[PDB]
Design a protein around this ligand. Structure first.
Ligand SMILES: *[C@H]1O[C@H](CO)[C@@H](O[C@@H]2O[C@H](CO)[C@@H](O)[C@H](O)[C@H]2NC(C)=O)[C@H](O)[C@H]1NC(C)=O
Ligand SMILES: *[C@H]1O[C@H](CO)[C@@H](O)[C@H](O)[C@H]1NC(C)=O
Lengths: 98, 198, 286
């Protein structure tokens, strides 16, 4: 759109930092991506059940992906999923990418 | 009655709770009776909502689409209901048309060194994204001579401004209002706060 | 689904605790071999017959392991002496050049050694640049642009070793910035400074102070995007702030400060040192 690109990801970051601060989401396990997409991170989250604490983030992630994963290997906790994603987006933010 | 939309519905978002959509029909109307505004978050797992529009000029109307919160990606299906008949199907991205809430609780206080201190309140809670990204504009002008004006630019975090009274007439009375915008979203300015005089 | 055979705990590097085991031996079935492991909390399901965790050893730690598609528990303990251990062990990555760690004693006359390791080091290294500031013992090693492991013990056993994992996205204290010039334009003061070497404005958060007898003013700026190419020079390694409502008739004195925000790294509230001061305006020679 007509808004600066940095601001999108900027918001995503601040939310995760904010969310990582009830810890988190009854611990429901999700498949990791241990790059690739924002979609991979999306389709592993929208599997969570009644954890509305992570709702906004899901919507945020769905904006990085245009309109059932690909290599189901491990399955960590949500908090550990988020904590791990957070510092990766930080890297891209320092790198000034997308 | 050829019911028609003479002006395509425009919309802006406070990026908090309320959005504002305005449109103009091709003739006088009672929207509280005739028009309905159905909007749905295209985060599909999500329910459509009805909006009861209010008259906005006897031939124009406005509705307020209530919301829990909003994020950049968020997008909405908009449909304008009469009756059953058409028309408007529309998409809306609150992120694209941010219209920040107006700042408030503006006062003036007398400090040492014959300096003046103006203060106001950030219209958002610390949790809200805009909270840290609001740069203000203070507008001080004389009523006597509206030509004798002054405009300041506030880019810091503390919603405050201190100036030297030596910049006033020492004589006349002044009115002053502030407004805000987020440079991070390239938004239109807010509404001017309730002007003060001292 | 029987339990896993012979769970083993091994410490790699400084504090990389590594649990290992063999499959359930035996069934065969068709339900594929799959493993789940707790903490004391920290849950994980995987096929691998091992789990590697990075954690301090200032306490005991137990992994329990099941099998599905009954839990076995093996644990590691630290070596102790416990009240004989360093208090308030802390590190800071200075300007992304060198790491500076300090500690206090535990509540004889004893010598401390600090060791450190991280991702790209063929050996655990021992720090040699020790220092003393009042009641404090400390070290400084070079570290130039993941996590770093730090432990400190005694030269002659005796004391319970003390561990510390430094994330490397926190504990970053940038060097102080440098004011490049002060200017006026119809009573708007413009301040233009230079951020420290290895930082881009985008990652920083600013504090400007201004002094006007006395009036200690201080601002907090989220972003200092710089766009007046008339009342500045432009080094584009440069950031700029405008202090409105100041008159040229008085002498204002300016300093700048900086710290990494919540993006890029953490907001550990680690302000750099103050910049050297720079003044503008009409003086008064009392
Ligand atoms: C800030 O963002 C605004 C809005 O995106 C930019 O204004 C747009 O300018 C382009 C041409 O540069 C026009 O085609 C668009 O119509 C404008 N956007 C809309 C939809 O209103 C503006 O250029 C940016 N301002 C700065 C200083 O970059
Ligand atoms: C002052 O006005 C603001 C903005 O309308 C409002 O949020 C706030 O509740 C008011 N603060 C006080 C103490 O009333």
């Amino acid at each position: 759109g007509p808004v600066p690109p940095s601001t999108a990801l900027r918001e995503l970051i601040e939310e995760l930092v904010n969310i990582t601060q009830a810890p988190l989401c009854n611990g429901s396990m999700v498949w990791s991506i241990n790059a690739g997409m924002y979609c991979a991170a999306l389709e592993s989250l929208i599997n969570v059940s009644g954890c509305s604490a992570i709702e906004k983030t899901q919507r945020m992630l769905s904006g990085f992906c245009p309109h059932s994963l690909h290599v189901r290997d491990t399955k960590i906790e949500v908090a550990q999923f988020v904590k791990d994603l957070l510092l990766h987006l930080k890297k891209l933010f320092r790198e000034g990418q997308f | 009655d050829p019911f028609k939309v003479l002006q395509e519905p425009t919309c802006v978002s406070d990026y908090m709770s309320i959005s504002t959509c305005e449109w103009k029909m091709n003739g006088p109307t009672q929207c509280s009776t005739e028009l309905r505004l159905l909007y749905q978050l295209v985060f599909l797992l999500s329910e459509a909502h009805t909006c009861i529009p209010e008259n906005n000029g006897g031939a124009g109307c406005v509705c307020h689409l209530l919301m829990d919160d909003v994020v950049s990606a968020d997008q909405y299906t908009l449909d304008l209901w009469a009756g059953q008949q058409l028309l408007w199907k529309g998409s809306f991205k609150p992120s694209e048309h941010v219209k920040p809430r107006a700042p408030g609780n503006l006062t003036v206080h007398t400090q040492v060194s014959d300096t003046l201190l103006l203060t106001w309140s950030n219209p958002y809670p610390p949790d809200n994204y805009l909270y840290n990204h609001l740069t203000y504009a203070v507008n001080i002008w004389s009523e006597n001579d509206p030509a004798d004006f002054r405009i300041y630019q506030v880019t810091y975090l503390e919603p405050s401004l201190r100036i030297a009274a030596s910049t006033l007439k020492s004589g006349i009375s002044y009115r002053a209002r502030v407004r805000a915008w987020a440079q991070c979203y390239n938004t239109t300015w807010s509404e001017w706060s309730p002007s003060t005089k001292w | 689904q029987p339990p896993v055979t012979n769970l083993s705990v091994s410490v790699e590097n400084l504090c990389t605790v590594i649990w290992t085991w063999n499959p359930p031996e035996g069934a065969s079935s068709n339900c594929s071999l799959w493993y789940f492991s707790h903490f004391g909390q920290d849950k994980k399901i995987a096929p691998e017959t091992r789990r590697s965790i990075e954690v301090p050893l200032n306490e005991r730690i137990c992994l329990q392991v099941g099998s599905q598609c009954i839990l076995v528990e093996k644990c590691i303990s630290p070596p102790e002496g416990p009240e004989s251990a360093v208090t308030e062990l802390q590190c800071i990555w200075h300007n992304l050049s060198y790491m500076k760690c300090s500690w206090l004693p535990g509540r004889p006359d004893t010598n401390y050694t600090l060791y450190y390791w991280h991702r790209s080091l063929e050996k655990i290294h021992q720090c040699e640049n020790i220092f003393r500031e009042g009641q404090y013992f400390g070290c400084s090693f070079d570290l130039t642009k993941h996590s770093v492991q730090i432990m400190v013990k005694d030269n002659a056993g005796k004391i319970k070793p003390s561990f510390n994992i430094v994330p490397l996205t926190s504990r970053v204290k940038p060097d102080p910035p440098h004011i490049k010039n002060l200017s006026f334009h119809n009573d708007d003061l413009y301040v233009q400074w230079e951020n420290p070497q290895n930082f881009i404005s985008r990652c920083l958060f600013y504090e400007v102070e201004v002094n006007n007898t006395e009036t200690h003013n201080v601002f907090y700026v989220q972003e200092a995007k710089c766009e007046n190419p008339e009342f500045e020079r432009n080094v584009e390694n440069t950031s700029c702030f405008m202090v409105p409502g100041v008159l040229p008739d008085t002498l204002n004195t300016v300093r700048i400060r900086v710290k990494t925000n919540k993006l890029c790294y953490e907001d550990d509230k680690l302000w750099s040192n103050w910049s050297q001061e720079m003044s503008i305006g009409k003086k008064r020679n009392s």
